[PDB]
């Protein structure tokens, strides 16, 4: 009956932007029921960890098999090894320059974009997964992406890269969920793209700005 | 005695290619004696581990305080830091293409340098480095460096790559240690910037390539 409340929920959720919890809102979605994530976490830094823990297990059960969810952390690898989820490969997202030019170490313009895909009885699998869908400049494990600017919540991160994690692991019509979704990038890309969406955060305010934005935007494509 | 030992092996051994068990080599040296290591290692995959362990172990004691080691590795991060180096930043390699089209996921054309600092009694440090040394180039986390392709060496790194390690972390007379020396790409860069060097191999065969690479190159500085 869990199971057929969350579908339930499913239902209700697709195409929205619905205020909640990350951690409570994964956990009202049914196993197997999403193709891809796209998402850039927030924030005691055992606590964080093992909360981010709970989170990605949250998503290793409601992925797909074969789906996939790309993980953009602002070390690291040590406890991200520690979940359900199966670490596919590390993406760099070369942001072009940073302002931060103090020189006791090389210019720190790259972020980590890590490449998840689900586990089933702790067992390996290869993601859906299409390259050729993508302009040669991206087909690499770099993307030069230089930042959104333009942008008016305080980190998110640019349409043109959830548009590449999504084209390239989905089909018209699968869910893209972002459990962390902010200003809603991830959602207008899966919008923009013919994918269903759903987010969730705690920000009425941001969840204006999603509704906001997504009318104002025409649905371009920013890829190709 | 077993520090006059060292000592004196460290005398024996400068501007020398050692051929020599890499851990044996380096249980030879005294501790804070090596101002930078660039090095890139061979090869149970938990054998292999406690093995790299000991080999970085045994880098931080015989590392300087404020010393570099630049480990090229061929979730490598999470034994990484089981060790009483302190990793300081990940530099990002980018060799620009690979011949690996495999479309089941991004080109694999990355290589991560792990830069390690010597921590003593378990606390931090800024290492040595001279960042304004290099060209803008080189200034960032990701260095574009095609691969030595001419080096008939089964994997070796370019002679650039090393160069730009020893030139930010060392004085003229400083001493460069590569504990896998292979080739002598690090002991080559180090002589021809007017550093010491000191390379372990168990390759006579190696030892000789570097000895015949040595007379024959012109101390030629790939960098600026
Ligand atoms: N416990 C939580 N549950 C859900 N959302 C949260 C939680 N804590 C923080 N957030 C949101 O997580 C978001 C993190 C952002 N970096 C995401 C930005 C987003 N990727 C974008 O492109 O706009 C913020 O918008 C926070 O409001
Ligand atoms: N136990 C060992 N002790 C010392 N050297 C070793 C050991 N096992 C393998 N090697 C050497 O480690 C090297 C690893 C190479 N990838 C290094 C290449 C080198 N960085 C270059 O630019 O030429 C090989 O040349 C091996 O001969």
Same mark, same amino acid.
């Given at each position: 009956n869990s199971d057929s409340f969350q579908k339930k929920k499913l239902k209700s959720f697709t195409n929205k932007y619905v205020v909640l919890d990350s951690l409570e809102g994964l +956990?009202?979605? &049914? *196993?197997? @029921?999403?193709?891809?994530?796209?998402? @850039?976490?927030?924030?005691?830094?055992?606590?964080?960890?093992?909360?981010?823990?709970? $989170?990605?297990?949250?998503?290793?059960?409601?992925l797909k098999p074969g789906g996939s969810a790309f993980y953009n952390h602002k070390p690291p690898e040590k406890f991200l090894s520690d979940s359900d989820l199966e670490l596919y490969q590390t993406i760099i997202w070369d942001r072009g320059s940073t302002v931060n030019q103090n020189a +006791?170490?090389?210019?720190?313009?790259?972020?980590? $974009?890590?490449?998840?895909?689900? @586990?089933? @009885?702790?067992?390996?699998?290869? &993601?859906?997964?299409?390259? *050729?869908?993508?302009?040669?400049?991206?087909?690499?494990?770099?993307?030069?992406? &230089?930042?959104?600017?333009?942008?008016?919540?305080?980190?998110?991160?640019?349409?043109?890269?959830?548009?590449?994690?999504?084209?390239?692991?989905?089909?018209?019509? *699968?869910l893209v969920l972002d459990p962390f979704a902010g200003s809603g990038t991830t959602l207008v890309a899966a919008a923009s793209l013919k994918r269903s969406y759903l987010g969730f955060d705690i920000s009425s305010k941001y969840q204006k700005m999603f509704h906001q934005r997504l009318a104002t935007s025409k649905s371009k494509v920013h890829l190709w």
């Open positions: +956990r009202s979605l &049914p *196993d197997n @029921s999403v193709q891809c994530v796209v998402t @850039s976490p927030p924030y005691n830094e055992d606590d964080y960890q093992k909360w981010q823990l709970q $989170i990605l297990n949250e998503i290793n059960r409601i +006791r170490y090389f210019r720190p313009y790259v972020e980590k $974009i890590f490449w998840f895909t689900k @586990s089933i @009885s702790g067992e390996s699998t290869t &993601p859906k997964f299409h390259r *050729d869908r993508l302009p040669e400049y991206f087909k690499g494990v770099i993307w030069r992406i &230089p930042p959104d600017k333009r942008n008016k919540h305080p980190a998110p991160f640019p349409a043109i890269l959830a548009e590449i994690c999504i084209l390239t692991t989905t089909e018209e019509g *699968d």
